[PDB]
Structures are given as structure tokens and as C-alpha cells.
Design a protein around this ligand. Structure first.
Ligand code: CL
Ligand code: CL
Ligand code: CL
Lengths: 148, 145
């Protein structure tokens, strides 16, 4: 468990929202995902994690002030949409041993993962359990299908 | 302890080393400090935490064209350690305490928006806990007239 790192088993299927993300794109993201929260990044270019926004809060803000006159996420945040601070995260190089101990002892359900400050994934017990299982029962290699 | 945050009691007296920090400056930092490790940041301008470098390894590399910078010594073999856990400016004292106690930690660096901004050890933690019930009196300061 000391050789397996979070980057090996983390879920890459996360959708980051940036302060400069066009409001049209924000609406598309919110109406196409069902996650409870989204990692907020400084800019689309940097992807530097700076906070967390809860979907329920973002939905409420969008319903109140529906999206020429181009707008971005920062406009909605400046308008009053609540954001949450980042107080704990995993890192790409955090070991499976460290991650499991952290989740167990702090009674956590999930955490975002950063690498060089950038939001790169998330880990929940679903991913953790899969990694632990692979320790003794590694899955068979993935197979491909193609039009020969 | 839910209202006191790490940024309130962390030690701001940290010296980061950046990938583009000239070796001349690296020598100045090492010779003027007494810590066993330094937070490594992407660039002097960004201060984005990307790793940790141990004093002993820096010394070894130093004891062994373009202006030579830290990144050059790292490329030549100086080992770097990964960041696997940190505190954040907004982490609460309650959270910090639990983290240190349950994981048996002695210290961690603190980041804010990805930037290295301080460090916390039991020295700072104990002072914060003490201040909860016995806060120090406000200090008096003079203006430079
Ligand atoms: Cl488990
Ligand atoms: Cl794995
Ligand atoms: Cl304090």
C-alpha cells in the first residue's frame, strides 16, 4: 500500500469550474452532472484549486439570475453565490496507505486531489476499495475492440 | 476551535526555494536558516508548492552558460520529496489538531490557493490552544515619526 499512489486509482472524471468559465458553459455543466459539489479553480488556463462550490447553491444562484453581455462564473460569485474553503485534499503522490488511514481516522467520504496546485481528480471509498482489492486480486488487462 | 483557523497561528517565517531561484540565492538561504527541509515552489513569481527539498541533499549537491538555478541542481541529481499532505489557510484549529493527533504528525506546510504560505508544528499548535482560554493582551507599538 506504500507503492500505490492516489494518482493510480483516483477518479479523473471531475469537472472543474473556473472563475472565468463562461456562464453558458456553467449552465451546461450543472445540468449535465449530478455531483454535490465542484472544485473551483482560479482560471481555465491554470486549473489552480482555490475553493469549492456546492451544486445546490450554484443552481439557486442561476435560477435567480439566469444567464452582447457575456458573463462568467465570477460574476455569479460576486453577486452572492456561496463558496466553500478548501481545508483538506489528497495529492497525486499521497500513498494508498496514507489515503486509507486519512479517510478512516477522519471519517471522510471523499476528497479532491491536487498536483502542483491543480485539481486533477477525486477519491471516494468506491475508488479506495477498488485499489485495495487490486492489491491481492489485480484485474485482467483491458481489451480493445476495433474495426480491423 | 471551530472558529480559529490555521492562518491565525501558522508560522509565516518560512523560506521557499523556487525552481528558478539562482544558486547564489540558494546558498544564501541555506546558510541563513536552520531548517531540515524547504518547500519547493514552481517559480519565484507563483510560489505554487510543488515539492519539498531536504537541507542535507541541497548541501551535498552544492558541495559537488546560463545562470545556474535550483532546477539545474535538481536535474543533476538532487533528490526531491513529494508533498503528500498539507494544511490550508482556512483549515480550522479543530481540524488541524485532529489531523496532527490521529496521524501522529510533528509539522506540515500550509497552502493558500496553492501557494506555500507558512508552516505549523506543535509549537504553534500549542500556542493557539493556549490562546483559546488565555489570550495574550494586545501589544503596544510606536509610530516612526
Ligand atoms: Cl478499506
Ligand atoms: Cl490501482
Ligand atoms: Cl491564535
Amino acid at each position: 500500500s506504500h507503492h500505490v499512489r492516489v494518482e493510480h486509482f483516483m477518479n479523473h472524471s471531475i469537472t472543474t469550474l473556473a472563475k472565468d468559465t463562461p456562464l453558458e458553459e456553467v449552465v451546461k455543466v450543472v445540468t449535465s452532472t449530478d455531483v454535490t459539489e465542484y472544485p473551483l479553480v482560479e482560471s481555465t488556463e491554470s486549473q489552480i484549486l482555490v475553493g469549492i462550490v456546492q451544486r445546490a447553491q450554484l443552481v439557486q444562484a442561476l435560477q435567480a439570475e439566469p444567464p452582447g453581455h457575456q458573463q462568467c462564473l465570477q460574476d455569479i460569485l460576486a453577486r452572492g453565490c456561496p463558496t466553500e474553503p478548501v481545508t483538506l485534499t489528497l495529492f497525486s503522490e499521497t500513498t494508498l496507505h496514507q489515503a486509507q488511514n486519512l479517510f478512516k481516522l477522519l471519517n471522510l467520504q471523499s476528497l479532491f486531489v491536487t498536483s502542483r496546485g491543480r485539481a486533477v481528480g477525486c477519491v471516494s471509498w468506491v475508488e479506495m476499495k477498488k485499489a485495495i482489492s487490486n492489491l491481492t486480486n489485480p484485474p485482467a488487462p483491458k481489451e480493445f475492440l476495433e474495426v480491423l
